[PDB]
Amino acid sequence: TEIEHLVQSVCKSYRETCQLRLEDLLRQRSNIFSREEVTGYQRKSMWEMWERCAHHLTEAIQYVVEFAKRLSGFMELCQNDQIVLLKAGAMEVVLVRMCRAYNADNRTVFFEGKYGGMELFRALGCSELISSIFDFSHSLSALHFSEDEIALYTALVLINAHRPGLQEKRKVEQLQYNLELAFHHHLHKTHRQSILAKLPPKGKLRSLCSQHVERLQIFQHLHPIVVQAAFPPLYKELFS
Numbered sequence: 182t183e184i185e186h187l188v189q190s191v192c193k194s195y196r197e198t199c200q201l202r203l204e205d206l207l208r209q210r211s212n213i214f215s216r217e218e219v220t221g222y223q224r225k226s227m228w229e230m231w232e233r234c235a236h237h238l239t240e241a242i243q244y245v246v247e248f249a250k251r252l253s254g255f256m257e258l259c260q261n262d263q264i265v266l267l268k269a270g271a272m273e274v275v276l277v278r279m280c281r282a283y284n285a286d287n288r289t290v291f292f293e294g295k296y297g298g299m300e301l302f303r304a305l306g307c308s309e310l311i312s313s314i315f316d317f318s319h320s321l322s323a324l325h326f327s328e329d330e331i332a333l334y335t336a337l338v339l340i341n342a343h344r345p346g347l348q349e350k351r352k353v354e355q356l357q358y359n360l361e362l363a364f365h366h367h368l369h370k371t372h373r374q375s376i377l378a379k380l381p382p383k384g385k386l387r388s389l390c391s392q393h394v395e396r397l398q399i400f401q402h403l404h405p406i407v408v409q410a411a412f413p414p415l416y417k418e419l420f421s
């Protein structure tokens with residue numbers, strides 16, 4: 182029942198930090214930006230669109246940090262390892278979380294109160310990267326991830342003992358094994374083991390997120406936003 186407790190606690194942390202309620206996201210699917218509203222976004226400066234997106238993304242990261250902090254055993258890891266795991270995984274989790282807010286039927290994402298396609302972001306001049314992010318969401322949406330599946334899978338995105346630079350690898354391994362067991366046990370219970378073969382190849386998420394963060398760093402170098410820094414040890418690793 183320790184494993185059943187872990188599922189409960191991981192799902193609770195997810196529920197408290199998921200940002201956007203699934204029921205809201207699904208209900209709002211019909212609420213789509215008009216051609217006029219799309220043009221409005223496309224006409225905005227690259228730099229205004231950057232400010233908006235950067236602020237949304239830092240907020241998304243911060244919810245992922247809060248998620249991690251409420252995972253059993255995470256706070257008992259040394260700060261070095263906490264940072265190593267967050268620096269490697271927090272944005273990967275954000276990209277995974279996007280799939281909930283993505284509608285495969287019309288290739289739109291929920292953004293600033295309505296659904297819009299990737300063309301909403303034209304002013305940023307990142308069409309290939311953004312298309313790749315949308316495509317990643319388009320792939321994941323075919324899994325029809327449940328909320329508990331997202332919670333358990335994203336916990337594992339973070340708690341990965343293979344990240345270079347861990348000081349107490351065996352401590353991270355122990356957390357990882359318990360989370361893997363929780364996830365696999367849960368899939369068996371719900372007759373959802375079929376998703377295991379369909380999950381992203383790990384390299385895919387890594388390279389996509391690496392390219393994403395690279396682009397965020399470029400924008401930040403050219404036109405830095407001011408961040409409401411909630412987690413100084415992590416902030417210090419990403420900003421300079």
Ligand SMILES: CC(C)CCC[C@](C)(O)[C@H]1CC[C@H]2[C@@H]3CC=C4C[C@@H](O)CC[C@]4(C)[C@H]3CC[C@@]21C
Nearest residue numbers: 200234237238241275278279282290311314396
């Ligand atoms: C490279 C960047 C300059 C441009 C990235 C453009 C994206 C891919 O077009 C970004 C912009 C805003 C981003 C979203 C901002 C906040 C959220 C809430 C979070 O809970 C899930 C992801 C989600 C829904 C993001 C998904 C990707 C987005 C939708």
Ligand SMILES: Cc1cc2c(s1)c(-c1ccc(C(=O)O)cc1)nn2C(=O)c1c(Cl)cccc1Cl
Nearest residue numbers: 235238239268271272397401410411412415416
């Ligand atoms: C793996 C991680 C990637 C990433 C993290 S963590 C953070 C972040 C944010 C806030 C805090 C905090 O203390 O409140 C700590 C960390 N920003 N970020 C970015 O890619 C990013 C963004 Cl979202 C916007 C502009 C520039 C950049 Cl570089």
